[PDB]
Design a protein around this ligand. Structure first.
Ligand SMILES: NC(=O)C1=CN([C@@H]2O[C@H](COP(=O)(O)OP(=O)(O)OC[C@H]3O[C@@H](n4cnc5c(N)ncnc54)[C@H](OP(=O)(O)O)[C@@H]3O)[C@@H](O)[C@H]2O)C=CC1
Ligand SMILES: NC(=O)C1=CN([C@@H]2O[C@H](COP(=O)(O)OP(=O)(O)OC[C@H]3O[C@@H](n4cnc5c(N)ncnc54)[C@H](OP(=O)(O)O)[C@@H]3O)[C@@H](O)[C@H]2O)C=CC1
Ligand SMILES: NC(=O)C1=CN([C@@H]2O[C@H](COP(=O)(O)OP(=O)(O)OC[C@H]3O[C@@H](n4cnc5c(N)ncnc54)[C@H](OP(=O)(O)O)[C@@H]3O)[C@@H](O)[C@H]2O)C=CC1
Ligand SMILES: Nc1nc2c(ncn2[C@@H]2O[C@H](COP(=O)(O)OP(=O)(O)OP(=O)(O)O)[C@@H](O)[C@H]2O)c(=O)[nH]1
Ligand SMILES: Nc1nc2c(ncn2[C@@H]2O[C@H](COP(=O)(O)OP(=O)(O)OP(=O)(O)O)[C@@H](O)[C@H]2O)c(=O)[nH]1
Ligand SMILES: Nc1nc2c(ncn2[C@@H]2O[C@H](COP(=O)(O)OP(=O)(O)OP(=O)(O)O)[C@@H](O)[C@H]2O)c(=O)[nH]1
Ligand SMILES: Oc1c(Cl)cc(Cl)cc1Sc1cc(Cl)cc(Cl)c1O
Ligand SMILES: Oc1c(Cl)cc(Cl)cc1Sc1cc(Cl)cc(Cl)c1O
Ligand SMILES: Oc1c(Cl)cc(Cl)cc1Sc1cc(Cl)cc(Cl)c1O
Ligand SMILES: N[C@@H](CCC(=O)O)C(=O)O
Ligand SMILES: N[C@@H](CCC(=O)O)C(=O)O
Ligand SMILES: N[C@@H](CCC(=O)O)C(=O)O
Lengths: 501, 501, 501
């Protein structure tokens, strides 16, 4: 992911952390619920922060699997649990040769800070299996994930109340299904909540509506919240709204594909899509549906008819909004001065280096941070988990009751008015509007996911704005986010019996 | 140190492994129970060996502890489990700033190879907590080990049937007691075998006789087995026996102190004792009991009256036998040409580098390998574990029965002879010899430990000699040991169904 | 099996049971520890016996497996637990299309009666998977047994202290290994005794010496105990001993092959070996070692050079002893009048029908019953289980102690005599005989298995003889066996909240 500026992903995130640690250190000694004072309160805060930064647990595994051609192979895997300040750890599983102890630790800590930003009660965790999925058959991949689950289960790295994985790079519903099945068929066979051991499951296996596209939907909302402020767009030299905007996304998987689908829906036009092979381009825009079909049938976006094979880094293309949705450290000190985009919407985790962040602050480029912007995935994963614990489809017990109820409520206003305006008025039909007619039986699963996600992205967005203001951070939203996150994680160690001298 | 051949400890052991892997690879394709043939049998062996080398599990921990002065501190710890080919993993816990992921992995794998050499049914494991014990109070140390136990317990890194720790550098009965107590009071409170979760415990807590001095006793036996062969001493230019031998030990702790006590008992005289501060020397010998008292009262061996402060590396002193009983990589390419000793008895784990091994083979210096020589500790740890599972003091149920039994057996020969040689002979008292009188009621715990250890060290010693011969390895006992070890670990992997038909 | 007499396998055993139930019903009302009397004591015995006959639990399973060619297949399986009067149930696993609910129930009950006869503290159990192993690959078989284990484990039909399987028809070490591995890697991963969940395991996986040939060895002993009584051979018209005897075995697997090996060792000559394809014959005898090689290389005994393909039912061949070691109901009312053999040694379970038993009693043919004769397998399975619970190789802790001990004991007689017969005698070396020299270090695993089995077969044999006498049952050993068995199982009921209250 670079040579000159390839800081260790974990140290990189610690940098992001330490930055916010400075900014809020005062509000913390303030809110510190201690009878002691001065330097002891200053010291205590530092001690607590020193606890939060390092990952509490990291499991490195080396297990064998029998390949299809009879041969034996040893594959490596890791799962790090950054924090248990909130009982169930949460974090996906990545399948890639790029994975390593440090990459996983970094991702794990990003998970807990992001959960805090978005108010999801999970400490962060992350897993990685060092393989290139494309070099294995479906049958070998199944053996790999099922075996990996058991090793995690035996050491306490997976379970409804201990640690709940989910998809990430090169893993999806299929893998999640295998994980759930392995867990429920063995260790959790007596557990009524066995299927809540993992999220991102297929809908038919206890998964939840819109989880696959949840990150993209969330990316849309995160951009929407800022792109409609004017108090922010005036500083970038842009008009609010999506209608006259162009964007380019690096990555065309679960994050990239859906981010693109949603932005295109509200008027923004996709100017370029990138992948590992390369990228494509078209100033008149590219349609998300057609591109997905081409990719689906040909296995690559390159060669797409309604566009041209671009030659010159998808990140440097000319557009209003750049959405890196691939891997980490894609924007560094080297390519940063060349982004051409005014808004960097981080769909991926850690796509920009700290050094690249500076250049972006100088060139007046707004970087909507990953720990807020991509949290739509974990947010809906939280909903999936909750659904598995309740064992019911949201609304099932209340549809008829709320429907009958709303009609009687409306009938109460109708009758009251006919009672008043006796014969003068006549019949005064009080009927639902078309919109309320669709909400007549109350919320369903799909409804809750959508409105719940929009609500979360909005609540957290304001929180970040209020914080950027209170500390005059300008377009340094990342720092505002870590500030909010440290504050929330602090609340748990602080007020807690532990730390009461 | 010395700055020259300071290799990755783990890689170093892998080197030792790969060496033996070559030497036995043929006897393995031979004993391979496969219907297939040629390269497939050759390939299968390589695949299995590739499984055995890497550690299966490594847990890295970062947990906080409240220091005595109220402050918060984060301490790091690790426990690696190299192999589970034998269900309970076994390995000590080291307290040192020198500990790291690699050091622990290396030690862990040495544990499994050593258990195999000595026929103890445990896969290897090892733990390390990165602290210098001397910079903490007893109360802080207790909090550190108890908390470390819980973290290991919750992730499956300690338990009677999963993983059984023991002492190592800077840990002893005290720490083991804390570990047992923490485990038994929490997770294992219902477990009838809870106290078998750890070994090296104080005798009053379920520990076993002679475990503290077990490594020293074993070091004595390992040296005895070779120093009395002539077929080996002729090649070193020495006479068999201990009576006219001198030795120097680097380290004066659990290994060093007892190795010294036992060698001194059979006539060998200790010429020099070394520690981290430095060493002392006296050509007429130093007495183990007096040196221990001085050390006990003054906290250091330096300044001992019946000896002089030596200035010139304890490893280079002039003597017949050198016993490094401290830490790893103490004998390298740099100091090797200067040992002056003909026999290097490795009390410590990995004290000599591979490059140092060559120089030792050329200068015709016999290196009695660590995976055999120091295994007296694990061997007796195995006895402690067995004792905890049986819940009885060895002999308690049989003392009176065997005593009465032996007298009637002896009376049977007495009466038979008086019956024959009627009045010619007269009374023909058949009485035990003084030695048999002490064995009249059968073995006690102490008896089983001593005779069990001697037996083990002897059985394994012959096995190594037979192997050094079969492959003409000369004074390369280390390689003979790994050969024996790979052979034994191999057998659990071979078997049909296991690595598959 | 016929169309004439092919009684229901279960009903058939109930018949055998009811027969003995009558014979001992009186000694039971006698030994009944009741204050009440007459018919109430008579009634209570009947009630208890009504409890013992039916199997307590039977699990029928239907689970899918993915065949190698991608297709899906549903396989059927069952495991019955006849009695829990002794906590761990014990019984093998059969792979055959002949398996069914009734066959397994019958086998299960035979297991508990046989364990009682042989004094092994296990209630009986049995499993069967309805497949012909030859129509599946090794990989499919592995999936089949591993999946079957999990289904049994989840419903409490396998575990160290609940139910311990073992081999039977078409299953061996390999399958047992898969079972142990599946159990220990999942449900029993924390269990220190996980590997005792099954027996008949490969030696390198915790199996025990001589388990494979244990049934054959036991068959030898069972025949030996009766063939050397004269008080029994006079009634058959035979001389005691093996030297001048000929035999024919139906079945050349784990039971048949070893029964043949052991009888041939003590002078008896094998005249014919049978299999499903057919049989072979040679009046001068057939050598067990050569026949095994031919079978091993060609997959069939037919066509063996040092013998001829026999055409006429292996059971009707002319010989002194007939050993049916295949499946049940091979000797019925139809072929019984044609056995030509004076002794029927039942290696297999239920090879003779009740109706065939009559004809055998009339023709004065002694039928050494299966519940005694083939119990060598379970007996040694019991030793394997015990070994797994103790986690040590028998003798390992005591070899050197007992060796040193015996020499001092012998030295005590030597010194006592030299003390007496001062200079008259001179040196009076007291040295072990060659035989005692091999027993100098005490018993090893192999020693305990052999001597423990011989002891058991002998103790039970006398018990049966004493019972055949006390009731003048003549050559009706089967009934004597069930009498002994009901007595032992009933004892457990004549005191467990049963006869009481
Ligand atoms: N639920 C989720 O999955 C969530 C994921 N995220 C974030 O998004 C990333 C996950 O993407 P998912 O894992 O969603 O993506 P998926 O694996 O589908 O992404 C696939 C795309 O990534 C592209 N890609 C990979 N590496 C590069 C590269 N070096 N340069 C250009 N393109 C590249 C692939 O091209 P190609 O196929 O040729 O390699 C492919 O188009 C994570 O890092 C994570 O932080 C955040 C929240 C939720
Ligand atoms: N059961 C057991 O304990 C077993 C131990 N071993 C081996 O021995 C080691 C364990 O020793 P224990 O843990 O037994 O030792 P203990 O801590 O008692 O050893 C204490 C001694 O180690 C000396 N020491 C440490 N570092 C150095 C150095 N760089 N140079 C010179 N001397 C040094 C100390 O000097 P100072 O006090 O000034 O630091 C002290 O005299 C392990 O590495 C292991 O491989 C082998 C088998 C079993
Ligand atoms: N641990 C144990 O296994 C124990 C077993 N036993 C007894 O031994 C029997 C088990 O044998 P295992 O199951 O040991 O035998 P294994 O499957 O090895 O027996 C294989 C032999 O059975 C022969 N066979 C099967 N059916 C017939 C038939 N209808 N006619 C002629 N030969 C046949 C086979 O011929 P083919 O290959 O062509 O089918 C083959 O030679 C049981 O009934 C049991 O009572 C008793 C105690 C312990
Ligand atoms: N690739 C792709 N996936 C889709 C599409 N439509 C639905 N899905 C699946 O369903 C989820 C997307 O749901 P949405 O289409 O965004 O739901 P919605 O249309 O916004 O719901 P409404 O606003 O009430 O109409 C993902 O998890 C997909 O698996 C599509 O057009 N393309
Ligand atoms: N306090 C103290 N304890 C010691 C000393 N030396 C050894 N020990 C400890 O106890 C042994 C003491 O053994 P006894 O003194 O009980 O040993 P023993 O039975 O004569 O040993 P053997 O002669 O080899 O059979 C070791 O296990 C040490 O842990 C010493 O000098 N002082
Ligand atoms: N299939 C088979 N296995 C055998 C035979 N002979 C011995 N065994 C084995 O008994 C083995 C170890 O046997 P040893 O200790 O060398 O046997 P012995 O030499 O003590 O064996 P026996 O002659 O049966 O008493 C197991 O691994 C079995 O495979 C045989 O003829 N056929
Ligand atoms: O680990 C496996 C082994 Cl030994 C054999 C097979 Cl046929 C598959 C696997 S993967 C796996 C699958 C499940 Cl359902 C459970 C576990 Cl415990 C597994 O390891
Ligand atoms: O972990 C500890 C906390 Cl939070 C507070 C205190 Cl006063 C001690 C400890 S150490 C410890 C000791 C035991 Cl007996 C059990 C556990 Cl669970 C410990 O962590
Ligand atoms: O049941 C299986 C599934 Cl669903 C997938 C694979 Cl590849 C193998 C099996 S068999 C099996 C093997 C193990 Cl080790 C554990 C379990 Cl519970 C199994 O079902
Ligand atoms: N790996 C994604 C998804 C994790 C989750 O939903 O739990 C993040 O970031
Ligand atoms: N930690 C030491 C001893 C291991 C043990 O006995 O558990 C090495 O070897
Ligand atoms: N099922 C076999 C014995 C297996 C066992 O050891 O339980 C008959 O008897």
């Amino acid at each position: 992911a670079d040579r000159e500026d390839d800081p260790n992903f974990f140290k990189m995130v610690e940098g992001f952390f330490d930055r916010g640690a400075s900014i809020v250190e005062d509000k913390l000694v303030e809110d510190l619920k201690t009878r002691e004072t001065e330097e002891q309160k200053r010291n205590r805060v530092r001690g607590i922060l020193r606890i939060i930064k390092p990952c509490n647990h990291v499991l490195s595994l080396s297990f064998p699997i029998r390949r299809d051609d009879g041969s034996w192979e040893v594959i490596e895997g890791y799962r790090a649990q950054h924090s248990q300040h909130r009982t169930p750890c949460k974090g996906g599983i990545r399948y890639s040769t790029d994975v390593s102890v440090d990459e996983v630790k970094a991702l794990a800590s990003l998970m807990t800070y992001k959960c805090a930003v978005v108010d999801v009660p999970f400490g962060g965790a992350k897993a990685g299996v060092k393989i290139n999925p494309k070099n294995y058959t479906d049958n070998e991949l199944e053996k790999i994930t099922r075996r990996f689950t058991m090793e995690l289960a035996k050491k306490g790295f997976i379970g409804p109340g201990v640690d709940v994985p989910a998809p990430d790079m090169s893993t999806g519903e299929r893998e999640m299904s295998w994980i759930a099945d392995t867990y429920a068929s063995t260790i959790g066979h007596y557990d009524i909540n066995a299927h809540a051991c993992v999220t991102g499951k297929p809908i038919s296996q206890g998964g939840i509506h819109g989880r696959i596209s949840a990150t993209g939907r969330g990316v849309f909302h995160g951009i929407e919240n800022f792109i409609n402020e004017a108090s922010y767009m005036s500083i970038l030299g842009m008009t609010p709204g999506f209608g006259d905007k162009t964007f380019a996304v690096q990555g065309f998987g679960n994050v990239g594909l859906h981010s693109m689908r949603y932005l295109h829906r509200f008027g923004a036009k996709c100017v370029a899509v990138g992948e590992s092979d390369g990228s494509i381009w078209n100033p008149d825009g590219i349609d998300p549906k057609e591109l997905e079909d081409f990719k689906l049938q040909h296995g690559t976006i390159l060669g797409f008819p309604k566009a041209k094979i671009y030659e010159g880094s998808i990140l440097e293309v000319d557009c209003d909004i750049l959405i890196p949705a691939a891997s980490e450290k894609q924007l560094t000190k080297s390519n940063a001065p060349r982004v051409k985009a005014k808004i960097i919407a981080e769909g991926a985790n850690g796509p920009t280096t700290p050094e690249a962040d500076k250049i972006f602050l100088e060139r007046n480029i707004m970087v909507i941070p990953d720990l807020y912007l991509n949290a739509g995935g974990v947010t809906v994963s939280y909903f999936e988990w909750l659904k598995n614990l309740n064992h019911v489809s949201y609304g099932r017990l209340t549809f008829k009751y709320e429907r009958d109820s709303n009609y009687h409520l409306l009938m109460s206003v109708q009758e009251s008015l006919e009672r008043k305006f006796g014969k003068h008025g006549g019949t005064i039909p009080i009927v639902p509007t078309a919109e309320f007619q669709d909400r007549i039986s109350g919320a369903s699963e799909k409804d809750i996911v959508h409105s719940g996600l929009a609500y979360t992205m909005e609540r957290s967005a304001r929180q970040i704005m209020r914080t950027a203001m209170k500390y005059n951070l300008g377009l340094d939203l990342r720092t505002a986010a870590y500030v909010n996150a440290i504050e929330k994680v602090f609340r748990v160690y602080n007020e807690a019996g532990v730390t009461f001298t």
